[model samples]
Target: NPIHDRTSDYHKYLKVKQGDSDLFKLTVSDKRYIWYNPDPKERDSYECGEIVSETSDSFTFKTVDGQDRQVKKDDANQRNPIKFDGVEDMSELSYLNEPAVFHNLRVRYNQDLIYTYSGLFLVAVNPFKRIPIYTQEMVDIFKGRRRNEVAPHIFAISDVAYRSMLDDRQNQSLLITGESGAGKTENTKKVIQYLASVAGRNGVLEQQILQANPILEAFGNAKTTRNNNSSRFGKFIEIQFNNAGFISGASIQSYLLEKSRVVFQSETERNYHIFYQLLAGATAEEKKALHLAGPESFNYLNQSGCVDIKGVSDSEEFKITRQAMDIVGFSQEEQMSIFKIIAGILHLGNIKFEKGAGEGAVLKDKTALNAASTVFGVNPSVLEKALMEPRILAGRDLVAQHLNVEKSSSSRDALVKALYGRLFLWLVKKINNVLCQERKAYFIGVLDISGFEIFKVNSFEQLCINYTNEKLQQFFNHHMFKLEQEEYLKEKINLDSQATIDLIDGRQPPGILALLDEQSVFPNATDNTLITKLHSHFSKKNAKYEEPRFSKTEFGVTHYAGQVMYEIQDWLEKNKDPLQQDLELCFKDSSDNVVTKLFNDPNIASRAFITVAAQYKEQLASLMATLETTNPHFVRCIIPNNKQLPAKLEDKVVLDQLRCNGVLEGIRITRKGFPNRIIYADFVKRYYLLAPNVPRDAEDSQKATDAVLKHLNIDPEQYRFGITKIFFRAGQLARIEEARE
Candidate 1:
């Protein structure tokens, strides 16, 4: 019976021995049996009763020919049991190793299943299409159940984090991590949906929390060849829960806006979706007011002919995003201001500067400048002075200096970038102010950030992203390996964790990040200087560090996943990211309160001159601190194929991702030693029911746990007793969980 599917091995063996027939239901007039005809000419067949009477050893059964006969129990034939165990969850696999893990994931993917578990790590394969794995019934089945009791799923992962928070009264972080187009955003939404469904009730706060998705995506997401809707920013969403596990409030903190994409994108990628939405999705009245004819007219959107995505309606998305703005407490005027800022940015990008007949630079298109002035509430002459007439501090005084065409062009692009970046920050601040709830007992934060990127032309943005990835991997290693190794050392399990950490990005011996920062601060440091310094510092010391033989401006580093050659041209310029203080002053003089406040915010003021590396370093340090204080759950999202097709699992692609993300290493750790280590108290509290006859009190909890395991008939060979802990193999505790359930 399905009811007893997860019984003890002894009970299961007995069940298989004693049960050789399918259980069935019977009616008053009809009786069913599996039997063979007495005649040699007749073959085995099933029967239904037209008129039947039941006896202990015989029953009156009707054959298909309408003849009734006494079917004796002695003539019965055995029935085949249905196949149930088919590697549904990898955590329950017999052999916990790398090949087995990879094979099981591939098989499940071929069968249209995309989620599997490697112990606590959730490996999610992008399905590229919506599947029925996230139904309400599925949520109900996984709710309140241990991980081993249900099929391996993202819902089970969410439930585990949720219940652990309530039980331990601690914070939790769900680190949704993977490469681009790996469904991290979709899975992040799923986690929140599950939390809102099971934890929060129907209320205004909850509605607003859910509505933030469309609003954020409208501005933050854009179109790329890899993903139709790719988020160009990073966000951390904290869902606050009270002592009773009720959803109390939510707040959003965003980081690393790729503002450069506003002015430039490759032929294959489009700018942020809001730009297209304003042109293709706006009403006639709205279009005229914003001076937008079409996406073809805007320099930002026209450079790349990627205006609209296939099977997606930008007009509908814009309407929904506006409605979401209302739900998130955006006033009509404030929302209008948002669109105006976007329109201003688009116009600013079109305003090019060229050398005049005179000494100073002049606008090539005065109409573009006029439109920007009207949208931003600044004078045309003021815009001209801000771009062409630069200002520098000369002994506590602002002095005007004529800028060449190149510098003026850079200034104009910088202004557009600041306009978009600051507007994004303003939107985040507004959302946080409105959506924040009262401080409560604990909160669950979900990080749906940009993944590690290596492109054809790697630049400063790629460096920042990879640096973030390095720190994240370090966090994972520290939590998953270092702490475990520390405990195992008490019992001398012979675990070495330091070697791998050093090989990737270590702190002491000056890893790649440290070397880069050291070179960034050199006086007038060029790309050549940076490359030369990297070679001088670690070429002989670290095998992973090297300069490419093909080019002087390029260098290569052998990362944990693989080696990537990076072009270091214009590294210092991008890293410094100098802002035009004169433009800030122009906005400080503007009549638009939003424009004025964007320049004068205390938060933005602090980082006005900070280098990109320092900014990211501070942000990452803070991010790590926040993660350090919370219990972490890792969800390693995987892209089965780069082609974005469903049910197509490429073996090499999947295996490479597994290696890059340390799935193989995780398996080896679990196999070489113990996969699970739990404190004695938690272990007992969870499994005490398995040993009901065991003694409750003892001199210590370890002794009491030993007695409990002994009484529960647990195999001593499957687990080891630590000084204050219990270590079990991969599936041992899962077996205990099944029997307990």
Candidate 2:
């Protein structure tokens, strides 16, 4: 059942039998949330939560009093004294043993800006990371304009990430990650602009970036069946540089793309690119340019506007898009040719169909092929076959996957329409490659992905991102990258020097490639003689999802990827007695060493971690109870647009993600299992712009700072608490800005 209300009897904990151990960590849902930090130092579950008081957005809890809040994810302060058992010496496990592909973040500080670098590129994180070119004066020039600061805020972050990477580092990487529409992709681009300008050691790297998004818009971006700005996959770009650090070579690798987005979409969104690109884009000029026709000319986009709202301008987009075509090096004639194909698809959708008693739907429009024979350049019948069956080119060979004939016209409309939709995402990757051709290994990889989208059919795509976080969580376990920085500070590794804090950025090495290696285990996980035995451990009911048969993909056989996606169903079914809860695990590293690491991991409020967590529940409950009587300020970060979306309130992925991320990130959990929060009047806070009423005094000026977090109930403390200070460090310094004048 869907978790309509997390505060009620909502989330159910998952029980798993790990190895030979007899214990189970409480998980929200197999797909929703996994175990986190169940143990502190050694072999902690990566998904556990401690409850403070249940607020609407976040849970309030403390590991070691209030020290945890000041610690950023990648800051050194996070490495704290953790609680663990049976630990092994980690000195033997040298991180230097890993390769560059495993690297996730690159740290650097040039001028004043500090950031994590990636993609043979740089992205700015701090406004302070100014090069000689992007001086404070120059930044003021951009800021002088009285425009909304959304773009500026983004640029400031890019400035930090980018400026830091160019300080003479051989290799750098930065990850612009978030669910789509949280602005991941656009943030990636902004970071690139800063680096592309200043990355060359001697200004030799002044080459334009190369990457491809050349597939027509009809094929790539769309107001889709999910969120408005949904992206298909996680793409990694490599920008190679010469010894002089000038731009040389660049390539991007994409992760699990939502190919199925084509066959069907939600009530409001269409497939990725095809639907909106054509509906809003096909101009009379584009028709004149292509020597063809209108929006109805294409079956892909034209058949679907009635399904979803098109918010972007496609006609103007086409005009500008064609120009991008040139900037990215597409020939004018080729651009026109691409437009002509879109025209052909338009006419294809209009092809009339006649019904025969025994047959399903059959094409009856004889002249349909003749109307656009010039475009396809082949007989209409061949064109039909191509549409009916896609000879999908996979590297050197072509294997075909046919869409089944569903009875609904809308469904068939979806099948044919989805083809163009898939093409759109492919086009985005292709076009990005072309535009980023000048990009080198030092380029920044930006991603604007879909926000949390747990829908009716949560599929493998969700698994990819979930796995990415899982891998990131593993980093936290060892305090390797972002998590490492935070742990360092909590452990008080180097607390005295601000420079020492700044120096922390370059410490934790990047390990994206190694993380990928671990993920390969999903498709690459092999079963010993324990397959049937493991199967026996699960209850027969849940085991219906797992048939002790692990199928290998052809690619898995070759390079080997796992054919089956793993879930808890198998383990759940076998242990019908709920004995999966009894299973315990003995986690070891690649070297078979018992793991004993934590990124300033705060102890969980689990029943077992009483001493380690210092019996936090009582302390937290006291904190919350005290807050109820003492708080003079309250902040309720509500999803303001929730009541207005076309989808159901609880069914949306954003809300689900809001819930899952809140808990996983150690937001407070309630006895009822919600991650709501209620903070006291006195605590650390994030900075924002606000103007508070100042009382004029005999003094030269009133220095009263406006506090955005006003206590809804109390008034006197609210006067003293007009402003709250926000702290930011390296990893947390990616994309944000706050100021008031």
Candidate 3:
């Protein structure tokens, strides 16, 4: 019956007479608190929460508006945050045992149930009740279901973010970045999920939504350590609308990619999906066009230990990817244009150069051109010219480059690789450009780029990736600190926006641009800036690409940083992509239309523009469709993890830290942002925490905490809301401050 007020114990830290002072005041009985070792031996998992339950290790009791609302576990289910007693600082949970606790808490709480219909802020979703989107139909659907219905979260969050956007109709972007495998790509799907669900397509077919997946998966996904389902790069998808809130256009901009991974091998052999799909799916015609036969045919996609991914059929994905290309607004002719190149690369990959009977090596197999004629029904010579010398012909400028490609096998193979790579980059840029065309309204964009994992060798790929991340983090910082923007602008009175951004982000530097485009640092820097600046930037940062050290020769790796490989082999040491240069000519019919070109190639397929491109425009048209609908509400999903599980600290240390930090706001289920559910240790750990820390005495104290934990009302082990886990720290855990007004 006697739960000591945590603040009373912290009297020394405050003016005792003043009673807990201002900051220490526990608005709720279980105020959020953390304890950091500041020094520790290891560092793996940082935070954790278990399903709240009786007879568990340890737990925090949060009082909502003064009610003793502590997490509780049910015999009915186990996935819940275990209730804790003795442990204080929120860092005692172990990593392996954490998920169960958090997963259940989510089930118990309903994010949709609006806690406050009308609060202080202008129509805001109550943090206290961030659960399911409350609707008669929705509640009916979840009547007895255990699984969290995906559609509801999307419906609710989108409603919130969009509503916020309507209040201020300006372009808005949502950034969702985390360690790989954190469900970024999955989360992004939710944004589109909500848009399609609520944006009033007037009963659109579900097939369309489902169909969208295959196309994106084919090209966008890759096998990375974090996610079997990983996106190779960043995507900025736009949903455009007209003045009346009708759909107009839809598009996307893809950020940098981990292209070096293609040529390199990871301990795990999971490359991007495109490599395998291309090998498996492309028709004979498609292959012949690219001069490829199997995955091994391409130097980039072939690597050791590349795991096979399931769920996508190369043939099926090809159809959909192609369909999506058409849906975006590409002319039939344009559709054939990029595909012709892709197919041509396949054939080019097939050619094997071996020493002939005499002086030099001869192409063992027919070249990419020969294969192109076999598969796509296009003339080999014409396709070869297209790949080799695609000039833009802008106002008589024959803009494309690399026209005089050598017929020799080696030169042709290298040209094939460069052209293919350029194709992808160009397509991405073009698509993203289309997405940016309309931004008068708000649409949620979820970015699913994984966290940083420094492997042995770092190279050009890492440089591009880290640079992209740096820019993204910069955006997050700006949003978190609005006031800083004005000061930066004042400092650079006459400078353009790019300069100011460069100063803050430390990317897109003038020196590097000059070196790459203008050759300030190296002669012919224009041709190889991509490779040079890469070494200049990241080489010094993460061990300048360490060769994979092997114990013997068994697991040997002759590691090569991208720069080293490029320099040594002159790999990627070429002029712009020839076909990319021809983009303008390819779209010569529409000069205003964006085109992909060498070096400056925008990585979007002209075919994709027809469908995906129009998708953006169609989104604009949706404004008229939604006129009768209620005011739009947009939800921005930001996942912030702040659960630092303590490994060294026993119940005693944890309790002491909690005492110092303040106990009113026990353990915040969601640390960085307010989330609906919370987790703790399971039934076992809760009781252990409350037990006496004394070396010998535990039975009586354990019983006391166990009794309190047993009777507490909040059901913790429910996945109806969210999940939690207790983590064991390899090192000290640090607490991030909660965002303030």
Candidate 4:
């Protein structure tokens, strides 16, 4: 009856394959298939082949091109059976190889099945366009259902985490990771949606929790070449639930906002959505008060040559952002002040510096300076002095220092960056203050961070991003291997990522970040000097570190993902992330409460003295510590193709992401060890019926579990006994479950 059912949409595509016995016999009485690369240079270019004959050490296969070829058996990659073509989980495949995994994912993707399971993690390929699978009806169908009972989905995983959290009374985290354009943000939203719907008490708080996305995206997201609405910052949103399993509250923690984008953007990218949205959506009165103009008027917004995203309306999004802010409890005055600060940033971008006669910088036009000062609620002349000449601590005396054109311009940009960064942190703080609950039982945190990135020319930001990913990957390794292996034996397991992690964050030898922090304290350190010191410390000493022979500024680290060469240009200044004390003093006395708090808030201002790299490392360490306490679930999102188009799956692109994200390595470990594990008491309690003589209430659950397995005659190769749990090979538990059913 189930086989005849066609109500499911996927059922229509599940047609039976017809057998041609005569043709199959002519080809080969015994059928065997292989994955062969016709072009050796292209690793992803694979074609299915049938083996017609074989030699002692070689396989003679007839290629899809109608040519017979001989390949070494060791070199030949075995293809999965047709029945395993689109299995929900990759671990179910008979041949667990790269080509086989790729073939299975491709088959499922072709059928519009974007979510697939790879061992302990989920692999989600971006469909580029909408798929109707995320409807409310679909959410209801997946609610409380076991993962195997339903089709693989983001909602399914969310439910599993939710159920696990409730059943165990432990906190949970869904670590959603992917490159830009890979649907990390989208999947993150879906997780929240599912959790909110399933756990909602039908109150306004649910709507508030859901509305937080638009507000955050407006200020923290941008249009990059890789993604239309890419999140320019990392966020961890903790959705809190009470003991009754209803949504109580939520808190958002954001990290490393791309402050540089406020002043400059590369070709084909736009600044944060707030800038364009404010310009397009603000009323005439609001614009006049803030001295706002078109995005093209601001040097910061216009320099990127991309003022708008193709299909996104900044004006419409601006309204939604405001609506979300209201729902999230932003006061009217607070909202207005936020927009004023944004407008002030735009005005500050227009201020130009000219070299004066006496080696000092002079503001050629005070028009932009006056506009910025008015919005920021600071004196225009004071702000001008802060830009060109600010009082600095020279020994015991406070002395006014003159800055040249370059120094002044840099100072101005630094102010803009600092303002934008602080405003973002303030936004998060405000949101947390509104959404955080005084009494909460447990929380489910969703970490939606940027994936490992390697650009044409990597910089300080890239180093931070990639370094965070390296630590995260190491965390994954520790969770997947070390924790699991702890139950099996006391033997140590080798982790290859530790060396690279040590090279970056180790304190004994003062790794890259530590060394950079050390150099940041010196006033005379230049980017060149920093690079030279890095070379001296790591060039020949560390296996993971590399200093390119031809390039004096570039150094490479073999991260867990891959090799990323980082350029040390502006390393010193970027690490210092210095905001002039005079500028801080100028903004501290602002009339606007929001502006005043941004500079005067002790929590925000106290961190000004710490170097950026050191701060980021400390933040990352805290995040890891938080993650360590929770039951972690991983979802690795994949971009189907470089070009974000529907129905196009680039094998190379998807495969590279898989390789980098440790999808394949995860599969390899899963296959090599027990993929399914259960505690001894639970296993014995469930299967004790098969061995009636062995009491389920036995004091030693381990011995009872052994007796049950032996009574059922489960093969010795099918499972391994651990101290606290029994670990089973793939599909072995299913056989026992079938017998129980």
Candidate 5:
């Protein structure tokens, strides 16, 4: 039994390796090592225990549970040696097909090795600390290597995608997703790094491309409970490559900025990195000119009570961001404009509201108002009017509206949010425009979107995040089904898993996303209205959608990964996301050039607002549509512990991620049988290296494919010849590919 060895030195001692024929009785010491077959779908199934009866061709074994199982002596399934971290791929595990195999191996590998292959998918665990793995020597090792030829790392994934693109002459995309702190952004940076290193000579544009991450992170990331620098937005990066496979240009598109955080923060979480950096890193002259203050002096920064983080220096971070801005082509004057706006937002937070003599809110904080007005280059009187008093449109007449203190505060927060959000977009566009060049022959894209979040109190934002995951899940289902179906049809194998997908996308009771979007468009809809519609639509019909047992204002969605309960406390407000007509006054008439450009047209201020849910769905639909046109890759990142502690493995938490991320279902399909497949020409083109005598341009696809396999001496049982393709069991062709590499 090799299962309990602390040192995985297989050659230390062993009676037998894997794939053996024998009937061996196991003692209590070997209980964990014993393998048993639970499902009867396989060709041979066997259980483990004492042998009650034996024969040359038949035998029976009884377990500790008093259950008896019988099998032929020569055909019984036995526990193959548990290889621990020795196995490169999970698909090679002999028996005990459970998520536990993946979890144990993932933890085992993450202790020192940080990457593993769950079949074709890549699983990355957050190390929580830096290790010396990304070096020039390491990159060279993974260059041009097959999937399993080298150690599992993100570079290998990048190498494979690069080779596939060059050999096949097609576009490629890497879709990375996980919880907030699971290193998706870090991995995305590595992907770009590897691409720049391998795809072309190190050039000026490539250097600028590498510098983009720091700038983006400064504006778009914040400190969440689970991560120190969690991305508050989703980004899709496109890197263009010339026909010669060199990096030519790049672009970045980001959406769903968590702008609400600019004005709000919990005691545990900090605001976006830019705010703190500006306070700590600015020069004395710049600081005094922008209304001198430290983070503690600002209301927005003080309320969070987390101005400085342990092991981090905001002053140093600010300097790094400034350097990055310089690399991204921001002049000192242009840079000051950004800091000025940031300073204005901080001062805007300090503007206080109080009861006025006229029964409406009045601006009581004169100093903060003056600072904000001076920083934004707006007249103090106009700034006061924008927050204290607002005008509205009543039919053909313009009317003046008065607000109480609470209303005025809300209006102020709205202005700050809009300012930060719009500026973030503008910065991204400037960066993209600077990086843009003539189009290339093809491009590779990396998508680092926010993961599915379920908090104690979920809101419209949570709905949007979850909806993105829903669409990704749908893509996973369809893409997996497409691959499996392609193999099943070619191999003439009969296995169906469409039920898992149809459960989500099938329109009988309508999926949760469809129902939410439908209710979003209804006239005068509320959270209560949405819940009622859900109950009427899916309460009795769909198992995935349901009302909570304890409450009426919340609903439970049994997502593919797990179940999450969503609270709709202010669903109407969240969905509408009403941009106040008066908040528009703050920036619309601004003297600052960037602010004017963002909100210059009065018609733009009067533009109709769409519900957040509706808008998110359309963005999701467009993303999926674009994804379908390219070769898709999946990298599922896992957060080992909720406490953000290292070297901890919670089984339940890990298993839920495995289930939610489709690892379990994907492995189940692979375990049932081999679904490995390749088209005829591709098979010949790739494997022709193994048989040099094979024709370069074979006239007949089948004849050419069969001849290559025969010449390469591939086992007949391992593969099946098809009309226009070849089908292989798991790891069969992979080994052949490994041999070639």
Candidate 6:
């Protein structure tokens, strides 16, 4: 039985005509219906009306208010037919306008149907609550099923990608993207779950693969104003399969962990879950050795005035994290060392500085310093010296330069950020070591990166994230437009975002990232200087770049999504990401293995000259290189409401997302271009019976395809003749399939 079987209750309910019988019955009988608000100013306002008269230019309608109104034929957005009221796919609707699309989504969303098809990709509205569609039975139902055979679902998409990978023997990638709190992460988990169940062998390797999530979440996710468990970083996981299509192993690639959160968080947000988990769940004996205290006692954890998430128990979550670590093959000593690092960061945060009699800073009390040093197994005196004043090479002399209170505090924060950042990378490497197999036939990579972001005060992090999204969007355009149309030889649709992409990542004339890298190496360059250089280069020269007249330190880029203004307050320092050599030296010989490895690892040691932006650029290039070789599937998650509540779909909020994520743009291109295509051979083989004169074993497949189509008398407007394939307009292929049946 197909998921959308006509005999099902859902299909029957969806097919039922909607509206009051007295008013709409006659309206439907006459092929007329009420349209939603046609004026932009009257939001959430609707009028029930029918066409009383019509001219060549406009329609005269009478509203329920007993008033006559006129709307131009082009301006009026007519409602779709009742049969397309709750259509599973938006492409099936005759009217592909905004109101019609919104109404269809609204109808299905009101019925708890959160997934819908929008031509090339799937649109998933965040429910903000659990739905019972992700069970073993559901996964089984989607197994080996065609996309149209089932209702739109994350599982259905995952199954399709999995099958494509196996059938074509090519690598596959599922690009899952959306804004924060938009269910991107949740849907990512579902994709993983579906793949694991369908392709997984019942073994310990699969269990280890599943357990990787809890550990990563505890370390990488945090409480934000938008979500309780928002992922603070981006992740891509490749689930490798053997020749037999069973799970062979897996690996993860993470991007841009928000290291600043270690030292600071917003008013309502909290630090990473590992901090609270360690403080709340440590054993009495373990706490004694680690000098652990409540979250309130630590500056890092308490500065935001938020340490707990609603409905979450830090102690219980700690057990799950620990259990996940155990399953991922973390040794007892490794676990102990990891907790020690967490506790050490808290202790280091509490090590306050005071002004000394001279220009140098002083640590009047060494209690917190001693606690951190003891946990990290580093010399306390050396650590204090590294924080207050460190030796530097000056004119062939090892001079101990004095740092003021602010500089010392910043130094402490830098060490904290570096420690946490390096530890995260080490954790990823460790997990890969455990789950990665030397022998694998192929893999399906899933990218769960942050979507395009535009905040009130966007900064360097937002720039990097948005830059990545820009490249990804360009990749999407390349596949959707460039590749699809190139096959037709046959087309030119100027959806290229390469100019904007070049404005950010180009190096010939030095783009934003390259300019930032150049300014980072300069000893005297300030944030203002960097901004001035950017303005001088791109303010008026580049159409996609903007330097707002009102703001001196902010620059804007007109991305495919929208224009995002980025503040240059800390671009220099953030790009440099400077960590003092003395601090690295102090931890280089620590007794704790993890601490020693973090400072001495060749990867960290080699990053001394590279700026943060340059490193991210290289990594992104590598990721794109991998994706270009694979078959791509896109899933755009949507946040229905900003409040994270159920049953409330804010119209403006959802509409903006659809436009930004390119769902509407996709539908536009899909409607205008040939969205369905079949090779001449396949067309001839499948439709030879419709035309008796056309031979199934025809010498020229394209001629036979034309003959068959001509014999059936297909409208020339319905399709076009490409070089090797017959390209059909939207729904034209469905019509031919129906006719053949």
lDDT for position 222 in model 1: 91
Cα error of candidate 3 at position 354, Å: 3.1
**Candidate 6 minimal-lDDT segment of 10 residues:** 22-31
Off by over 4 Å in 6: 1-28, 31-39, 42-50, 62-67, 482-494, 605-608, 674-741
- Model 1 spans > 4 angstroms off: 1-86, 356-360, 393-399, 482-523, 605-609, 674-741
Candidate number with greatest lDDT:
4
Of candidate 2, the 10-residue stretch with the lowest lDDT total is 553-562
TM-scores for all candidates: the values are 0.78, 0.45, 0.49, 0.89, 0.79, 0.88
Computed on alpha carbons, the lDDT of every model, listed in order, comes to 0.73, 0.33, 0.38, 0.86, 0.72, 0.84
Which clashing pairs does model 5 show? Answer: 561-660
Better of 3 and 5 by lDDT: 5
Give the TM-score (vs. native) of candidate 2: 0.45
lDDT of 4 by residue, 1-741 (tens): 322344554343332222445121132224678899887879888998998999999999998879999999877787755656787888676567788899999999888888899877899999998877777766787789788767788998999999999999999999999899999999999999999899999678888888887888999999999998999999999999999899999999898798999999989999999999999999999999989889889999989899999888889988999999999999999999999999999999999888848899998778999999999999888899998889988889999999998989999999999999999889888888888998989999999997898889999998998889988898898888755666456422216778888888889988998989898899988888899999999998889999998999999999878899999999888888888999999999999889999898988665746788888989999899999999999999999988889999998998899999989988777766676567788776666766756765677898998888888889998887766777777556645654431
Clashing pairs in 4: none
Model 5 lDDT, full chain set = 0.72
Q: What is the C-alpha RMSD of each candidate to the true structure, in Å?
A: 13.4, 22.8, 16.6, 6.3, 8.6, 5.8
Order the numbered candidates by lDDT, best leading: 4, 6, 1, 5, 3, 2
Q: What shift in Å separates residue 295 of candidate 5 from its native position after superposition? A: 1.5
Indicate the TM-score of model 6.
0.88
lDDT per residue for candidate 6 within 1-741, as digits (tens), equals 524455543343223333444222242334454465645476544544677888999887877776788878776656655656676788776557666678888888888888888876798999888877787867787899898777788998999989988899999999999989999899999999999999987679988999998899999999999999999999999999997888899999999998899999999899999999988888988989999888888999888889899999999999999999999999999999999999999999999888957877898889999999999999999999999888877869998878988999999999999999999988998999999988879999999987899999999988888888888887887788655556567532226588888888889899999999999888789989999999999999999999998999899999889899999998999988888889989999788999888989977544646788988889899999999999899999999988999999987788888889988888777767665566788777766767868776688998998888888899988878877777777556644644432
Model 1: weakest 10-residue lDDT segment is 22-31
